[PDB]
Amino acid sequence: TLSITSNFDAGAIDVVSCDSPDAIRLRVRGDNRSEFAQWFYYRLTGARGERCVMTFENAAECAYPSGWRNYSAVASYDRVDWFRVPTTFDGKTMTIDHTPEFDSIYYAYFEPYSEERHAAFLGAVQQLPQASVVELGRTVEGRPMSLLTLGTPETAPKKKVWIIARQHPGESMAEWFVEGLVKRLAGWGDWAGDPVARKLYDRVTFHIVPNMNPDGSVHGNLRTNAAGANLNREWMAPDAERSPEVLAVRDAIHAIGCDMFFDIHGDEDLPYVFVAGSEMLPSFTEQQGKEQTAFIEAFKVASPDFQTEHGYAASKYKEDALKLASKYIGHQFGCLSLTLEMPFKDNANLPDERVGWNGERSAALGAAMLAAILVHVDTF
Ligand SMILES: [Zn+2]
């Protein structure tokens, strides 16, 4: 007897039919208070050594159907080690065809990043002499909005570098990226002995929000918070009831100041790591151009995964572009301001059939970007 369950952190699925392994019928559940549908995460038990054919009947009705083109789902026996599994898409339905090796398995859209993991990581990070953690406010559902500051005393004002992640809760790659970056700043693991963090603290103070959408995350949402708001459309006029997550963070950025800004996302459609810059802003000066180009050049050197060939086609500027964090910040502060995008699929330039794009590659990217930040501040 097969059983599909989803009542856990970030769980999401609607089961249509589940009584023959070769005829499992499913629907992407969708965001809790929004029409956007794309994230899925479920547990399947009772299928050891049985070929499971799991068809997502509403695949074409999802937020980004091209997200299913050349895409493989991820799976795990224990929530620790994740791997890609055989998946096909015909523009109408999506099907995972996989034979579980053990009694209990999970399938998901991307390697998850749980609330527990967040709490364990921040609970350890706060113990570093250079760390502090401040609760800026509460989410819709009373979860903390936590700001991690990493820095040493100013004896000359240090540059304020802001990194926010996971405004879109299903983009768990964003929190993995922050974890890799923070681990390097901590001098943990293989980062012990590395001089980049030390040099950085002489020039820069970091202000980091690892999870911009705690509620959306646990809800199994892709794009919205628990009230149905797209947080990355709330930056020009956030609300205490609808978008307290942005209200609290935007207030802190204004109070604290900002010299460099990075908004960390994942992209459904494109199999590339890329940035969206501020060049479309009418406020984009020659010096800003010089600075953005030079950071991008440094990031290309720091990380072979990062590239500029592929990305969003930069359409004409419209006033509502300021609803997006990196544009709002770019316009308001006149500083280096970027959206960074990681793929749900793989990096097509450097594919990995076993894992595609994942937690470890996202984290390596975050650690690499630190080295580009250092190069950058040492130049400007
Ligand atoms: Zn996003």
Run of H or E residues at 124? helix 115-125
* One-letter identity of residue 32: N
Residue 12 Cα to ligand 1 middle (Å): 19
Distance between CA atoms of 367 and 310, rounded to whole angstroms? 22
Tell how far CA 233 is from the center of its chain: 16
Q: Which residues surround ligand 1, an ion (CB under 5 A)?
A: 168, 171, 265
CA distances from 104 to 18, 21, 84, 88, 283 (A): 15, 14, 16, 23, 54
83 to each of 214, 305, 350, how far by Cα in Å?
Answer: 25, 19, 16
Do the Cβ atoms of 135 and 145 come closer than 8 Å? yes
Q: CA-to-CA distance for 254 and 5, rounded, in angstroms?
A: 43
Three-class secondary structure of residue 107 per DSSP:
strand
Resolution of the experimental model in angstroms, please? 1.9
Q: Which position among 291, 319, 341, 353 bears the catalytic label?
A: 341
Residues near 91 by beta carbon (within 8 Å), at least 6 away in sequence: 60, 65
CB atoms closer than 10 angstroms to residue 116: 10
Tell me, letter by letter, the H, E, C secondary structure of 12-40: ECEEEECCCHHHEEEECCCCCCCCCCCCC
Per the entry, the structure determination technique was X-ray
Dihedral pair phi/psi, residue 164, rounded to 5°? -115, 145
Residue 213 and residue 245 in contact, taking contact as beta carbons nearer than 8 Å: yes
User: Distance of CA 153 to CAs 95, 125, 157, 187, Å?
Assistant: 55, 18, 10, 18
CA distance 309 to 289: 18
DSSP 132-162: EEEEEEE-TTS-EEEEEEE------PPEEEE
User: Ligand 1 centroid vs 342 CA: distance in angstroms?
Assistant: 9
User: Does 331 show up as a binding residue in the annotation?
Assistant: no
Ligand 1 center–CA 234 separation, angstroms: 13
> Could you tell me the two tokens for 18?
């589940």
DSSP codes joined into one string, 189-233: GGGTT-SHHHHHHTTEEEEEES-S-HHHHHTT-SS--TTS--GGG
- Known active-site residue 341: yes
Residue in this structure with the two tokens 């935007």, named with its chain if needed: 250
- CA-to-CA dists, residue 340 to 60, 215, 216, 263, angstroms: 26, 22, 20, 6
265 is in an annotated binding site: yes
Q: What is the residue whose two structure tokens read 């919205």?
A: 224
**Cβ pair 151, 251 in contact under 8 A:** no
Q: Which residues of the chain form beta strands (DSSP E)?
A: 3-5, 14-17, 24-27, 41-45, 52-56, 74-76, 83-84, 87-89, 94-98, 104-108, 131-138, 144-150, 159-165, 204-209, 260-267, 274-276, 336-343
70, 271 Cβ separation under 8 angstroms: yes
CA of 309 from ligand 1 middle (Å) equals 20
Per the CB < 8 A criterion, the answer to whether 201 and 152 are in contact is yes
Integer Cα distance of 375 and 240 in angstroms: 39
| CA-wise closest residue to 260 among 292, 306, 302 | 292
| 230 token code pair | 């797209």
Pick from 190, 185, 179, 186: nearest CA to 200: 185
Sheet holding 83-84, edge to edge: 3-5, 41-45, 104-108, 74-76, 83-84
- Which domains can be identified in the chain, with CATH numbers? 1-113 (2.60.40.3120), 114-380 (3.40.630.10)
In the structure encoding, which two tokens stand for residue 97, read together?
């065809």
Any binding-site annotation on 297?
Answer: no
DSSP reduced 3-state for 252:
helix
C-alpha span between 15 and 34 (Å, rounded)? 20
Torsion of CA 357, 362, 365, 366, to 10 degrees: 170
* Separation of CA 170 from chain center: 7
Q: Pick from 152, 164, 129, 160: which is nearest to 199 by CA?
A: 152
CA gap 214, 283 in Å, rounded: 33
CA distance 326 to 329: 5
Centre of ligand 1 to C-alpha 254, Å, is 22
